[PDB]
Amino acid sequence: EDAWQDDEYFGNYGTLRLHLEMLSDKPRTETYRQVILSNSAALREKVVLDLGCGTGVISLFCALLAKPAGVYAVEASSMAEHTEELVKQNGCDGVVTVFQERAENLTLPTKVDVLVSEWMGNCLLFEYMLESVLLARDRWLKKGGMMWPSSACLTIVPCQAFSDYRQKVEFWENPYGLNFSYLQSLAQKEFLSKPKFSHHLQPEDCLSTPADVITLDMVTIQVSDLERLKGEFTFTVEKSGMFHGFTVWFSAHFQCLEEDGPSIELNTGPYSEITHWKQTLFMLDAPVSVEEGDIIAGSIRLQRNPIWRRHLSITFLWNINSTEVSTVKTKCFPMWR
Amino acid sequence: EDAWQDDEYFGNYGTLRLHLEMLSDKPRTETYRQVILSNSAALREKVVLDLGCGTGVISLFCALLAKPAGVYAVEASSMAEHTEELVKQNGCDGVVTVFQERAENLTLPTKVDVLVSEWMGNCLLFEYMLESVLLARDRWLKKGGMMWPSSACLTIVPCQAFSDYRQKVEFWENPYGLNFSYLQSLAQKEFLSKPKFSHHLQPEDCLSTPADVITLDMVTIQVSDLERLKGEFTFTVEKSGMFHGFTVWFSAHFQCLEEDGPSIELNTGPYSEITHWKQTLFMLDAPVSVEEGDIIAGSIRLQRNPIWRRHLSITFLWNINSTEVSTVKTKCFPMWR
Amino acid sequence: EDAWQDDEYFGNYGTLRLHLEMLSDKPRTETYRQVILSNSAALREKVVLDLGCGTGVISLFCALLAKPAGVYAVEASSMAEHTEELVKQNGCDGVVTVFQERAENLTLPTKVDVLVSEWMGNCLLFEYMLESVLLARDRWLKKGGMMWPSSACLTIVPCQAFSDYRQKVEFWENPYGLNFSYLQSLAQKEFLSKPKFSHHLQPEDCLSTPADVITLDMVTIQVSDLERLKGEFTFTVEKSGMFHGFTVWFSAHFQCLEEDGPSIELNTGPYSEITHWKQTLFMLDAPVSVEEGDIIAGSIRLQRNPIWRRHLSITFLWNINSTEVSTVKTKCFPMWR
Amino acid sequence: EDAWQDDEYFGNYGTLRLHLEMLSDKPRTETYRQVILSNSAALREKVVLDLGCGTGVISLFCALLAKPAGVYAVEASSMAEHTEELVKQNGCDGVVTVFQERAENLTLPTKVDVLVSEWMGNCLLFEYMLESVLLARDRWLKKGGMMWPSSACLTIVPCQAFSDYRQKVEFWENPYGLNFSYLQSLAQKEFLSKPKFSHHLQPEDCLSTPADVITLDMVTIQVSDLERLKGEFTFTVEKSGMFHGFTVWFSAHFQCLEEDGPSIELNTGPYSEITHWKQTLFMLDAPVSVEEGDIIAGSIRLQRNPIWRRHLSITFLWNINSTEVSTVKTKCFPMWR
Amino acid sequence: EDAWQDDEYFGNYGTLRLHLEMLSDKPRTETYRQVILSNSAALREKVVLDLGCGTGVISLFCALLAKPAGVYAVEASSMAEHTEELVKQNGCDGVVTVFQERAENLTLPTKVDVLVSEWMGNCLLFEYMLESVLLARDRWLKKGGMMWPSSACLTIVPCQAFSDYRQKVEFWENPYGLNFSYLQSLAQKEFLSKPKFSHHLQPEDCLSTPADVITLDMVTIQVSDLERLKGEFTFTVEKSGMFHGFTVWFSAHFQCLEEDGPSIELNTGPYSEITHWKQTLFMLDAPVSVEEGDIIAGSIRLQRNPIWRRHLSITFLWNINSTEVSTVKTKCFPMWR
Amino acid sequence: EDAWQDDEYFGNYGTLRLHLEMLSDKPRTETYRQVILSNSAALREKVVLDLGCGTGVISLFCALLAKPAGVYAVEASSMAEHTEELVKQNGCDGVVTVFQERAENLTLPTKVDVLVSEWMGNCLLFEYMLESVLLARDRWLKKGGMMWPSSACLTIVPCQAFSDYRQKVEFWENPYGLNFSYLQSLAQKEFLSKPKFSHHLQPEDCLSTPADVITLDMVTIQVSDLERLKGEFTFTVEKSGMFHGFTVWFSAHFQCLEEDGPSIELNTGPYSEITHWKQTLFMLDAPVSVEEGDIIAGSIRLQRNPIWRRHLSITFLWNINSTEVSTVKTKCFPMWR
Ligand SMILES: [Li+]
Ligand SMILES: [Li+]
């Protein structure tokens, strides 16, 4: 709870600021509402566990847009005290029970048919709320029950970012006519060493088609699998341009409760409506100019921080039109420790 | 050990201050001595685990007022170093072994026939030493063995407290002729929002007969049960008076080792000799005047803090002569976070 | 240096982040460059003290766009180590001397003819670098010497902010059809209690013409004057609209070294090019609808925090079409403690 | 402000708890009210500085029970925000101005005729608010002006305290029949090493008549004098009894504004009505039995802590019926560091 | 990870300082290299887990001085990022895989045939890296697999240390002719109360032959055994001299993978080449002069700290030519809390 | 007292450890004793201020080896409590008065004829106790009075340190046959970036004769002078060898109270008996081989840390057989922030 930094994590969720940003995310919130809508009939007399309910929005969707047997809304932060009043004021305190408890030390009156949760962090895994979700799945989800989302994908693409490199590195060349170029090394180390949250990747700055590189099956994935997640990639560049680095985002997928129904997707990428996650930019130390037909191949590794359990390091290995050990570049981005 | 705040908890017990207050509590200490006395014969050749022995007083009662096979005195604080000398100076180092260990990571040479411990916090559960006690019971207590105390009760009663309300809220009306009434809202928020430890409830200020609202069976209760403890209550007011709030206390019960013997009680309530726990007062934001025949019904919930594992919140729900949802009042007291 | 929080203040300036934001502010940086340009002849053989030179940009303007006798560039943060290299790489280490010292404990080889500094914080005074500037003026500026800026103004205007009130307060009414209105009180307390940095006030949202309310003469102002700065205001509303609160900004003025020359202004308000300061928004708890001819009169007080010497509280008193004590509203905004 | 621990000192005064204890002290508050009453005529058109006004009670006494020209109520804690409303609600905002400032960095519109303050700490000096008072006297009090209190006295007496020694030291001899005497050395070191705040000395436990040992003239005393305050004492014991140690208290004296009037005293000793300060007990390591005619002579030293400027150490030197260097005992009590 | 103080423990290993001291220890590093050499043939196609590989030295010995199937090099500190480059630069990235993970939450692709680790702390157990080693053994070591070291011994001997006692205690008698003897009690408490790391015990200062007092079988020892380790000792003094206290060291033993091969030892005692551990000195409060034929008998206890899990207390019980309870001395040394 | 870190500075001096190291320094302590001896007659009826007396050793030298009128022994740490007993036990409490006060807020009964103090830190200035000494000189030293030491010198010399460079940088080339050379850059940054305290420079490793580069006149030096101390140097190398860097030490000089007497020196350099200060080594990033007749010229700057007032940075500028701007190297060593 210290190397999980639980006081700070859950303290940030006791304030309205973070909830205001989540409910203002329309693609994110309306996706969950449509999953409940699209599955309303199948959810009747089911028992739902809303893990990390926050203000309770997903629980109210279940209770008001369907007729389940019961909904267990679980929130560890102080916001749970208000959730209890919100479900009362929306006429749902006969269906929704609110537990101010952590998923880890959770006691529910029965097992559940569906576990629904909005746990995705930056680059899917940041803050590792996924670990809580999986612990509660193992203890409380019935065999054959539903996980919502049911799978999740990490997608990447080699990209351009002239805006970022010129304002943070090439800016120092001649501002107002002065030679501040000596600061470029420290600009490199301070600005390009860390990932850039809330990057808005424009479609015309993709140098290939994005590829899913990691996929998580929410029914089979084990907590031990999250220690070290790695995927392979190969890209053939389709526009001539400048390879400044990689942009990353995720997708969440929601299987229909019934065989015959189609899946619902939450896409945080550049061809979908922007979300509060936006995309995440990882810049190379030095840009390299590419041209159509070039191949950028390698791997991406999401290595969990062994001490600070809410953090991870993302390591890129890549190669340009070569398969040799000596042309292989690497770079490691902390997120955040 | 950080969200258990073990350095501060066990640091406070390394000082004589807290032990002086425990041994100065005669009802508390003499009760344990009489349990050993009243059960002396049955304890012969039994093995006793004194969990959290402190100065070792309960262990010395066992070794000197009975003839057990062995006594394991377990103390995690630095006071254990002195316990070892105290048992030597009282001629008991052939019977009593002292382990400077936490109950949680405890290795004893054999299982035990009796687990005796003085673990009760404010309103029974504050600081949740009960969790340590139950872990050690599961690992070290033999099947059929004794838990002392064997059960524990939480008792409440609707009460008066003119002293408290006038000195902390109505004081501000006209002190020395000045109108300091603007401070009443902040008096309400600062003084009446938290429980008052060491309240001495006078018998003439009970507005009904006290009722046990929660009961813990020390043999069957599970650690998972302590996350959320709730009880129901109904009171018919017997004196006309003013309902300022509720007073809370506990009882500990000690079953005889032999069928035929009677139980021994440790009562911390207002009709028993005062203890170092006294009673605990929970005041309403605004007092309400009641009269004989009125019914005050509702529930009390002891919800454990999910982050700070030594803390909890106590939530009261109550209703006066009505059973409707819209006349239902609630108030939540932190203890302490 | 603790209630000045100097380790955090100067630590933030050892990183390129804050310098990148200052040099990217073109109105701010080009104003200083034009002051040097417009006064180039008058600055010859003058001695300049650049107080808090940062990267050294103002010092390089002096040394390269004029021919002073000497420039003393004073920087307390670790960035001074790099300033020394930057002035060398720009061929100015014969004119510019760099001192890694605080203004307060500063030893310069001679007194100076001009003290130039960019000290303005949010609402002019936030962080009170003005105090350092005035101490160095008293110890090191020659009688008759120049202060740049030579005066500074705080300007305010009653404003609209539909965007802010609807997204932070009225949002909770019916998001996705749920009644989250119970959270409005906590939205009020969390979002509207503090000033909003980096507000971009649109001209069509001014309900009157802005008025300078406080003016600082950099030659006569004393450090003791900064404890409590107060100004009076009266506004006649010119558009019908909704009075959500007040927007605040500042101006810095630069007198010509020679009688005959005109002053140069740095305007951070809504009718000037946007700066890294933008404007600062102070919202009322509840909006009030106004119409042409209405008068909003009162005062604004900038009260320095007695303990945390980089902080202050801004208190608004105002009245609408009345001069009576009982229609007088007040509200106090911390910035930040 | 760190070795003054100003955040904690002034944070404790932002809460109603400490103000409730001060206004509940009737001898303390009514003394100040009677000083204003007894001097009402002489205070007309005078300017009063209420240093550390807290809730503003002394300022309201001045404005309502006299007709001064103006009252400056100075409070560094956040309580000042409420003081401003309290003086408005009591119809005094034409006479009383409230400054949320520290005495040290204080700017008042004029000098003052009377400086009235309630600054006394435990044993007069604890927390050294006296230093603030003297700084403000030097900057703001007119020549010939009044200091209220005008002098202050520290009084001591050799005493008995059977209650304290038996419960904290001799208790360990045979509690419940166990030999816990090994803990006596640690009882001595933990309980008798520090002064005991809120001791209530009974008159029958004085072994001589109390003597003033230190006297402070509020007009002539300098801040440099507070570093090290020392007084001499000789006592002839009048009852036979046991010398457990010394009890200490103080007096504050209030000279009449006019020659012909008598002084008003605030006595915190054992022959006066009890105050929130009570008295302060300093126990010897070992008690010594005394009998009528014995002389206990020596000194008491109030040595200010050089690092933690709100703290001090009190050192006792004493001798019983001897004047030799080798029978001279010493003991040093921290308060609190 | 807080009562394990993992941020500080693993932060110290992210710096080269501690690795420089380990690789500069030739007896320590060459022992591991010779274990790999002496067992090279038997290690072919085995899978090795190097637990806590640091710079990776043991892993490079395995990969370069033998031909295993694979080596898993596990390092929780930030040094792992460099380990990955070092194994690449030494041509071993086909055999050695580097995991930046804690042993506790470790996921390896297969089980292992040999677990090799250098975990020994001061007096063998300080910092309790042994706990990590045993957890990884239980999860990842195949039945019948090898532990390196395979056993470990704690050795002690009664010793002389004139140097230490004269410089730290008897020094104060007459330095430069002044009588500073009053400081001896505080010298005793400050200097002799704690163990002395990096003591270099000379052979002529042993008063008997050293004896192994505790032995750990790395295959059978359980984590629960480390809570409290105790051994017995008897010494007959062989030189006449002064008994200042006890010196302690350890041995690590490495069984051959094949029955027929002999064991390899790492000896940190006084008759072996000095290591970075040196020896550890525990001084008595007062020295006692001994003569040939005297018997010093008792026990040594390594009691783990229940709160700070990297720490322990070492308690000595001893007796000189007597077997009586009243001649039995004890002394407890913290290491370090 | 926070950016002076007074709690840690003076807390380290409350322990015997640092006093044991000072009194064990014979050259340091005997020098002060001989200054008192050599000046015994001249000190009769003089008043001496021993600033920062510690255990009181210098005060006892004055009182026992001379007959002054009075000695004021001033110590801010808790050790002062023991100093008072030590002067009593050495029969000097009629001559020596002990004040537990900081020099800064010091009140002495009279001015003094001699101020004697042992204030020298590493490289003379580290920890800037010199500032306290100079403040007390200005307030308490009579005109014409003596400062002991009366002057102080900083000496430097270009040096060799094969031991240091090979063990910390070249070690990584081939330890045990592995190529750990990739770590050399981080060895450079971690080991050679900071000064090395307690370096023992051997005479045969001086590449020229040492030169005093900075000199402090204790009568004329002002506190404002300590902000930035700079000296110039030129060295002609006399042995052929390798220029690894510079070694630094200091001298303290003690003028005779009488014209006719000679000065006494405390030399901490390599040709004098070693002191607890030893010497301080500053290594270049890369060594350069020099030969007889080469000139190494430049400057050394002791720049005080503006925030952490006990710290400084030492900046070296140097040039080898050239006077051009482009062959000029620089390197800055923190000490310690
Ligand atoms: Li922690
Ligand atoms: Li601080």
mmCIF file of all heavy atoms in Angstrom, chain F residues 177-196:
data_model
loop_
_atom_site.group_PDB
_atom_site.id
_atom_site.type_symbol
_atom_site.label_atom_id
_atom_site.label_comp_id
_atom_site.label_asym_id
_atom_site.label_seq_id
_atom_site.Cartn_x
_atom_site.Cartn_y
_atom_site.Cartn_z
ATOM 1 N N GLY F 177 38.709 -11.083 -16.276
ATOM 2 C CA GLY F 177 38.655 -11.412 -17.682
ATOM 3 C C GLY F 177 37.397 -10.984 -18.402
ATOM 4 O O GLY F 177 37.267 -11.254 -19.601
ATOM 5 N N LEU F 178 36.470 -10.332 -17.722
ATOM 6 C CA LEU F 178 35.252 -9.853 -18.354
ATOM 7 C C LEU F 178 35.413 -8.420 -18.829
ATOM 8 O O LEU F 178 36.133 -7.620 -18.224
ATOM 9 C CB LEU F 178 34.064 -9.945 -17.394
ATOM 10 C CG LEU F 178 33.995 -11.264 -16.606
ATOM 11 C CD1 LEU F 178 32.963 -11.198 -15.499
ATOM 12 C CD2 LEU F 178 33.695 -12.403 -17.536
ATOM 13 N N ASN F 179 34.727 -8.095 -19.918
ATOM 14 C CA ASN F 179 34.806 -6.748 -20.475
ATOM 15 C C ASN F 179 33.681 -5.920 -19.874
ATOM 16 O O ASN F 179 32.578 -5.847 -20.418
ATOM 17 C CB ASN F 179 34.736 -6.775 -21.997
ATOM 18 C CG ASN F 179 34.706 -5.381 -22.602
ATOM 19 O OD1 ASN F 179 34.970 -4.393 -21.919
ATOM 20 N ND2 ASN F 179 34.377 -5.296 -23.884
ATOM 21 N N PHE F 180 33.963 -5.273 -18.740
ATOM 22 C CA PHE F 180 33.014 -4.367 -18.103
ATOM 23 C C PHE F 180 33.285 -2.911 -18.455
ATOM 24 O O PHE F 180 32.914 -2.014 -17.696
ATOM 25 C CB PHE F 180 33.023 -4.540 -16.582
ATOM 26 C CG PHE F 180 32.179 -5.685 -16.086
ATOM 27 C CD1 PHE F 180 31.686 -6.634 -16.962
ATOM 28 C CD2 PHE F 180 31.867 -5.800 -14.739
ATOM 29 C CE1 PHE F 180 30.912 -7.692 -16.508
ATOM 30 C CE2 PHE F 180 31.092 -6.851 -14.277
ATOM 31 C CZ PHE F 180 30.615 -7.804 -15.167
ATOM 32 N N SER F 181 33.923 -2.661 -19.599
ATOM 33 C CA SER F 181 34.332 -1.308 -19.959
ATOM 34 C C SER F 181 33.151 -0.381 -20.218
ATOM 35 O O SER F 181 33.313 0.843 -20.126
ATOM 36 C CB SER F 181 35.224 -1.346 -21.196
ATOM 37 O OG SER F 181 34.494 -1.847 -22.298
ATOM 38 N N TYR F 182 31.978 -0.934 -20.546
ATOM 39 C CA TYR F 182 30.799 -0.110 -20.795
ATOM 40 C C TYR F 182 30.424 0.721 -19.576
ATOM 41 O O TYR F 182 29.777 1.763 -19.716
ATOM 42 C CB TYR F 182 29.628 -0.998 -21.225
ATOM 43 C CG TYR F 182 28.243 -0.431 -20.966
ATOM 44 C CD1 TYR F 182 27.611 0.386 -21.899
ATOM 45 C CD2 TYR F 182 27.560 -0.728 -19.791
ATOM 46 C CE1 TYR F 182 26.339 0.895 -21.664
ATOM 47 C CE2 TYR F 182 26.293 -0.222 -19.547
ATOM 48 C CZ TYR F 182 25.688 0.583 -20.487
ATOM 49 O OH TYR F 182 24.430 1.075 -20.236
ATOM 50 N N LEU F 183 30.823 0.285 -18.382
ATOM 51 C CA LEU F 183 30.517 1.002 -17.151
ATOM 52 C C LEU F 183 31.456 2.179 -16.891
ATOM 53 O O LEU F 183 31.246 2.909 -15.915
ATOM 54 C CB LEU F 183 30.551 0.035 -15.957
ATOM 55 C CG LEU F 183 29.558 -1.136 -15.924
ATOM 56 C CD1 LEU F 183 29.841 -2.087 -14.769
ATOM 57 C CD2 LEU F 183 28.137 -0.629 -15.843
ATOM 58 N N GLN F 184 32.469 2.391 -17.736
ATOM 59 C CA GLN F 184 33.458 3.425 -17.443
ATOM 60 C C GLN F 184 32.838 4.819 -17.431
ATOM 61 O O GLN F 184 33.168 5.640 -16.567
ATOM 62 C CB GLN F 184 34.614 3.344 -18.438
ATOM 63 C CG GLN F 184 35.533 2.175 -18.144
ATOM 64 C CD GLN F 184 36.731 2.118 -19.052
ATOM 65 O OE1 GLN F 184 36.601 1.958 -20.265
ATOM 66 N NE2 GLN F 184 37.915 2.235 -18.466
ATOM 67 N N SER F 185 31.929 5.104 -18.367
ATOM 68 C CA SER F 185 31.277 6.408 -18.377
ATOM 69 C C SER F 185 30.543 6.672 -17.065
ATOM 70 O O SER F 185 30.598 7.781 -16.527
ATOM 71 C CB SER F 185 30.324 6.507 -19.566
ATOM 72 O OG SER F 185 29.675 7.763 -19.587
ATOM 73 N N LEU F 186 29.876 5.655 -16.524
ATOM 74 C CA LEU F 186 29.144 5.845 -15.278
ATOM 75 C C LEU F 186 30.090 5.866 -14.075
ATOM 76 O O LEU F 186 29.813 6.533 -13.071
ATOM 77 C CB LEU F 186 28.090 4.750 -15.145
ATOM 78 C CG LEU F 186 27.302 4.631 -13.845
ATOM 79 C CD1 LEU F 186 26.090 5.545 -13.870
ATOM 80 C CD2 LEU F 186 26.877 3.195 -13.638
ATOM 81 N N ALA F 187 31.213 5.147 -14.159
ATOM 82 C CA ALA F 187 32.272 5.301 -13.169
ATOM 83 C C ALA F 187 32.790 6.730 -13.145
ATOM 84 O O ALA F 187 32.969 7.318 -12.074
ATOM 85 C CB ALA F 187 33.415 4.335 -13.473
ATOM 86 N N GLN F 188 33.042 7.295 -14.329
ATOM 87 C CA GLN F 188 33.488 8.678 -14.443
ATOM 88 C C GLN F 188 32.512 9.627 -13.765
ATOM 89 O O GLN F 188 32.904 10.473 -12.952
ATOM 90 C CB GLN F 188 33.633 9.025 -15.922
ATOM 91 C CG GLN F 188 34.696 10.030 -16.255
ATOM 92 C CD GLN F 188 34.978 10.050 -17.741
ATOM 93 O OE1 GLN F 188 35.593 9.126 -18.277
ATOM 94 N NE2 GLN F 188 34.514 11.092 -18.420
ATOM 95 N N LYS F 189 31.224 9.480 -14.081
ATOM 96 C CA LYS F 189 30.195 10.364 -13.555
ATOM 97 C C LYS F 189 29.959 10.152 -12.059
ATOM 98 O O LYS F 189 29.711 11.122 -11.335
ATOM 99 C CB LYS F 189 28.910 10.169 -14.366
ATOM 100 C CG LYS F 189 27.625 10.464 -13.607
ATOM 101 C CD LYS F 189 26.565 11.114 -14.471
ATOM 102 C CE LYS F 189 26.743 12.628 -14.461
ATOM 103 N NZ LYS F 189 25.976 13.313 -15.548
ATOM 104 N N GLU F 190 30.045 8.917 -11.565
ATOM 105 C CA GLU F 190 29.757 8.679 -10.151
ATOM 106 C C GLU F 190 30.955 8.918 -9.232
ATOM 107 O O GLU F 190 30.789 9.459 -8.134
ATOM 108 C CB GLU F 190 29.245 7.251 -9.945
ATOM 109 C CG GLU F 190 29.047 6.880 -8.484
ATOM 110 C CD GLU F 190 28.353 5.539 -8.298
ATOM 111 O OE1 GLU F 190 27.680 5.060 -9.238
ATOM 112 O OE2 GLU F 190 28.475 4.973 -7.196
ATOM 113 N N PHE F 191 32.156 8.516 -9.645
ATOM 114 C CA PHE F 191 33.313 8.534 -8.759
ATOM 115 C C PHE F 191 34.156 9.800 -8.904
ATOM 116 O O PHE F 191 34.640 10.342 -7.902
ATOM 117 C CB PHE F 191 34.195 7.307 -9.016
ATOM 118 C CG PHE F 191 33.522 5.987 -8.743
ATOM 119 C CD1 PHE F 191 33.388 5.040 -9.754
ATOM 120 C CD2 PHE F 191 33.077 5.666 -7.470
ATOM 121 C CE1 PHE F 191 32.795 3.805 -9.511
ATOM 122 C CE2 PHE F 191 32.474 4.431 -7.215
ATOM 123 C CZ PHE F 191 32.338 3.497 -8.241
ATOM 124 N N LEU F 192 34.346 10.294 -10.123
ATOM 125 C CA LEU F 192 35.218 11.441 -10.343
ATOM 126 C C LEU F 192 34.493 12.781 -10.336
ATOM 127 O O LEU F 192 35.140 13.816 -10.545
ATOM 128 C CB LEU F 192 35.958 11.292 -11.675
ATOM 129 C CG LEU F 192 36.633 9.952 -11.973
ATOM 130 C CD1 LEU F 192 37.193 10.001 -13.373
ATOM 131 C CD2 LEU F 192 37.729 9.610 -10.987
ATOM 132 N N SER F 193 33.181 12.803 -10.120
ATOM 133 C CA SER F 193 32.441 14.061 -10.193
ATOM 134 C C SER F 193 32.459 14.842 -8.888
ATOM 135 O O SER F 193 32.260 16.064 -8.906
ATOM 136 C CB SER F 193 30.990 13.807 -10.605
ATOM 137 O OG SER F 193 30.350 12.958 -9.668
ATOM 138 N N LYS F 194 32.698 14.168 -7.771
ATOM 139 C CA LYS F 194 32.659 14.695 -6.425
ATOM 140 C C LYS F 194 34.062 14.736 -5.831
ATOM 141 O O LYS F 194 34.931 13.952 -6.219
ATOM 142 C CB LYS F 194 31.753 13.839 -5.523
ATOM 143 C CG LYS F 194 30.408 13.451 -6.142
ATOM 144 C CD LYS F 194 29.388 14.583 -6.047
ATOM 145 C CE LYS F 194 28.115 14.265 -6.846
ATOM 146 N NZ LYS F 194 28.222 14.663 -8.292
ATOM 147 N N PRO F 195 34.323 15.645 -4.900
ATOM 148 C CA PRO F 195 35.616 15.630 -4.217
ATOM 149 C C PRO F 195 35.720 14.425 -3.302
ATOM 150 O O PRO F 195 34.722 13.901 -2.809
ATOM 151 C CB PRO F 195 35.614 16.939 -3.419
ATOM 152 C CG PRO F 195 34.176 17.236 -3.214
ATOM 153 C CD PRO F 195 33.479 16.762 -4.458
ATOM 154 N N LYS F 196 36.946 13.980 -3.091
ATOM 155 C CA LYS F 196 37.224 12.836 -2.232
ATOM 156 C C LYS F 196 37.791 13.365 -0.920
ATOM 157 O O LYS F 196 38.946 13.798 -0.859
ATOM 158 C CB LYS F 196 38.188 11.869 -2.912
ATOM 159 C CG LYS F 196 38.463 10.605 -2.112
ATOM 160 C CD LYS F 196 39.778 9.991 -2.557
ATOM 161 C CE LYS F 196 40.313 9.007 -1.545
ATOM 162 N NZ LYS F 196 41.748 8.725 -1.799
#
